Amino acid sequence: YANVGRWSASINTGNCPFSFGKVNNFVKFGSVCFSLKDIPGGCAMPIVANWAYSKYYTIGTLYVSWSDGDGITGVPQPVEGVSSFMNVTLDKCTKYNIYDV
Amino acid sequence: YANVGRWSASINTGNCPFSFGKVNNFVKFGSVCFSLKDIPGGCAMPIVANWAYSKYYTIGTLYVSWSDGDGITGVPQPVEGVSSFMNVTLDKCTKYNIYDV
Numbered sequence: 001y002a003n004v005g006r007w008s009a010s011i012n013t014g015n016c017p018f019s020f021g022k023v024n025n026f027v028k029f030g031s032v033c034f035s036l037k038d039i040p041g042g043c044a045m046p047i048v049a050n051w052a053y054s055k056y057y058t059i060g061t062l063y064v065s066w067s068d069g070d071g072i073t074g075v076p077q078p079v080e081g082v083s084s085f086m087n088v089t090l091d092k093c094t095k096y097n098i099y100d101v
Numbered sequence: 102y103a104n105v106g107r108w109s110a111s112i113n114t115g116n117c118p119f120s121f122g123k124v125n126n127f128v129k130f131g132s133v134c135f136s137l138k139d140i141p142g143g144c145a146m147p148i149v150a151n152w153a154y155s156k157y158y159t160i161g162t163l164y165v166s167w168s169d170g171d172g173i174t175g176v177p178q179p180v181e182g183v184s185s186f187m188n189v190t191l192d193k194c195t196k197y198n199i200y201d202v
C-alpha cells in the first residue's frame with residue numbers, strides 16, 4: 001500500500017510473547033509456525049489498518065504458534081554453509097547477543 | 102506408536118490451569134468438555150510429537166473447555182453405585198485428598 005491520506009497499517013504483538021520483526025533479534029524456539037488461517041494453541045497478531053489513529057480495522061491477522069527450546073533462531077540477515085561468523089566490536093560500547101545472552 | 106529411534110510424543114498443558122493426566126487427582130469442575138475440533142473460550146493442549154527433543158511438531162491438539170464449580174470430579178480409577186469408599190492410612194505419612202482439600 002501507499003501512505004495515501006491518514007491511512008496506516010502494521011502487525012501488532014496481539015497476545016504473543018514476541019513481535020513480528022522483533023523475532024529477528026536472536027529470539028529462539030524449538031519449533032515455530034505461521035498461518036493466515038487459525039492454528040491451535042497459537043497467539044494471534046492483528047494485521048491492523050487504521051485511519052488517523054482514530055478508526056481501526058483488523059484487515060487480517062497472522063496466527064503464530066511455537067515450542068520453546070532452540071535449534072530455531074530468528075536473525076537479522078542471511079547466512080550460509082557450515083562455517084559461522086563471530087562479529088565483535090572491541091573497546092566501544094556495543095549492543096551484544098553472545099551465545100544467546 | 103512405538104518409541105522407534107529418538108521419536109517421542111505427549112500432551113502438554115498448553116495454556117490450561119491443569120494438565121491431561123493430572124486432572125485424575127481430584128480436580129473439580131461445574132462442567133468440562135473436550136474436542137479434537139476447536140471449541141470457544143477453551144484452552145488448547147498441544148499433542149506434540151518430537152524427534153531428539155530437537156525438532157517438534159503439533160501432530161494435533163486437544164481443545165478443552167470448562168466451568169469452575171463442582172459436581173464433576175476427575176479421579177484415578179473406577180467407581181460404582183450409591184455407596185462411596187473412604188480410604189485412609191492411619192499413623193503413617195500420607196498424601197491426602199480429604200473433602201476436596
Ligand SMILES: *[C@@H]1O[C@H](CO)[C@@H](O)[C@H](O)[C@H]1NC(C)=O
Pocket residue numbers: 085086087088
Ligand atoms: C558485523 O556487523 C556489521 C553491522 O553492520 C556489519 O556491517 C559487518 O559486515 C559485520 N561483520 C561481519 C564479519 O559480518
Ligand SMILES: *[C@@H]1O[C@H](CO)[C@@H](O)[C@H](O)[C@H]1NC(C)=O
Pocket residue numbers: 186187188189
Ligand atoms: C486404598 O488405596 C490403595 C492404593 O493402592 C488401594 O490399594 C486400596 O485397595 C484402597 N482401599 C480401598 C478400600 O479402596
